[PDB]
Every structure is written in structure tokens, then in C-alpha cells.
Design a protein around this ligand. Structure first.
Ligand SMILES: Nc1ncnc2c1ncn2[C@@H]1O[C@H](COP(=O)(O)OP(=O)(O)OC[C@H]2O[C@H](O)[C@H](O)[C@@H]2O)[C@@H](O)[C@H]1O
Length: 202
């Protein structure tokens, strides 16, 4: 097997800040999507990250993962900045997920701003070579050039942009609390993410 860092994905909670997706529902969906992928693929590790130790989504996911008896060597939560996992967290993760916007543009606050700021213009060049847009519930894997400061400092080799459902009425494709559709699309976003990650590993 390759090194563990090469088989580790760190991801943030998609859709639950700027996109205002309900945390209780999101946490159920995270744990179900994680359980589903770990049932299929060996030798991967998944790490849910959020910036604050008071994170409500981390607390919910921990509770639910314990109830569901998810294998805690293969999935766990971690407090940290997704762009500083090795340097500040002490945890090397080669692949990270981004909660993107549909046009795959930098900025916009949230984790998307942080990732593009850390990665620099290399990520915008590389992303434009892979895809021009995302639709909700889908993702795209982008190899991160070795010249990127994020690669040099944190060992990140790939970023997977993911577009989750949007519940925020001041953002594109707002679902107006259609959580039937919303829940399906967030399930799809996580499965798409995890499948892209597995396709990088194997
Ligand atoms: N540096 C970080 N490290 C780890 N987690 C973070 C970080 N920054 C935020 N989070 C967590 O990341 C999680 C997701 O929060 P969001 O980034 O709003 O994603 P969304 O899918 O709701 O909105 C996407 C839109 O916002 C974007 O700007 C795009 O431009 C889109 O327009 C939360 O748990 C955060 O606490």
C-alpha cells in the first residue's frame, strides 16, 4: 500500500454554512454516505474537518458515527483549517475537498476562499483544464501542481471541488426548503466526492 496520507481525504461539511443546509439533516447524510463508501472500499481513510472545536456539525457527526458504529480508524472528525492540516494539525492528508460554487471561481468566503488563497493561481489554472462548471450534487478532481504553496507546505496533491445543494435564497439554484430534493443532492455530492477520491487512490 501507498502511504496513509496518499489514501486520506479531508473534507469539510458541504452546504452547511453559506448554503444554510440544516445541520441535523446534513449530519445524518454525512454518516450514511461515509458508511456506504467504507462498506465498498478498503484502504481509504476519511476525515471530516471544521475550524472550531465548538463546531456543531462535528459534534453531531461524532454522536451519529458512534451510534452507527462506523470504523473509527477509517473515519474520524478533526478540528483544524483544511489548508493547514500538516503544518498546524500535524495530520498529513494529500487530498482535500472544497465546497465550491457552480462557476468554480475563487473568493466568496468560506472554505472555497481559503483553499484558493492557500493554493494560489495554480489551482485556478488547473481547475480550468478539468471543468468549466459544476451542477449541484457533483464534483471534479483537480491535480494540484507541485509549485503550489499548499502542495509544498501541506503535501496536498489533489483538490476535489464539490457543489452541494443550496438552501440560501441569496445564492444560485436555491431549493427553497425542498429537502426531499436537497437531501438527495447532498447524498449525491458526498458520493460523487468519495468516488472521485477512490478513483485517485486506485
Ligand atoms: N479553512 C477551513 N477549514 C475547515 N473548514 C472550514 C474552513 N472554512 C470554512 N469551513 C467549514 O466548511 C464548511 C462549509 O462551509 P462553506 O465554505 O460556507 O460551504 P457551503 O457549501 O455552505 O457554501 C458554498 C458557497 O460558499 C463558498 O464560498 C463558495 O463560493 C460557495 O458559493 C462549514 O462547516 C465551515 O465551518
Amino acid at each position: 500500500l501507498s502511504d496513509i496520507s496518499s489514501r486520506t481525504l479531508a473534507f469539510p461539511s458541504i452546504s452547511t454554512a453559506d448554503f444554510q443546509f440544516d445541520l441535523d439533516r446534513a449530519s445524518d447524510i454525512i454518516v450514511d454516505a461515509v458508511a456506504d463508501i467504507l462498506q465498498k472500499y478498503d484502504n481509504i481513510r476519511l476525515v471530516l474537518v471544521d475550524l472550531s472545536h465548538k463546531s456543531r456539525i462535528l459534534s453531531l457527526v461524532k454522536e451519529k458515527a458512534a451510534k452507527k458504529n462506523i470504523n473509527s480508524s477509517r473515519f474520524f472528525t478533526f478540528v483544524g483549517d483544511i489548508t493547514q492540516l500538516q503544518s498546524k494539525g500535524g495530520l498529513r492528508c494529500n487530498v482535500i475537498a472544497n465546497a465550491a460554487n457552480w462557476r468554480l471561481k475563487p473568493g466568496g468566503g468560506g472554505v472555497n476562499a481559503a483553499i484558493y488563497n492557500a493554493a494560489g493561481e495554480d489551482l485556478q489554472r488547473a481547475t480550468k483544464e478539468c471543468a468549466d462548471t459544476l451542477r449541484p450534487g457533483s464534483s471534479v478532481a483537480v491535480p494540484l501542481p507541485s509549485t503550489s504553496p499548499l502542495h509544498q507546505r501541506e503535501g496536498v496533491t489533489h483538490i476535489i471541488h464539490v457543489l452541494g445543494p443550496n438552501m440560501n435564497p441569496m445564492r444560485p439554484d436555491c431549493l427553497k426548503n425542498d429537502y426531499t430534493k436537497g437531501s438527495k443532492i447532498l447524498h449525491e455530492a458526498y458520493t460523487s466526492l468519495f468516488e472521485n477520491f477512490v478513483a485517485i487512490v486506485q
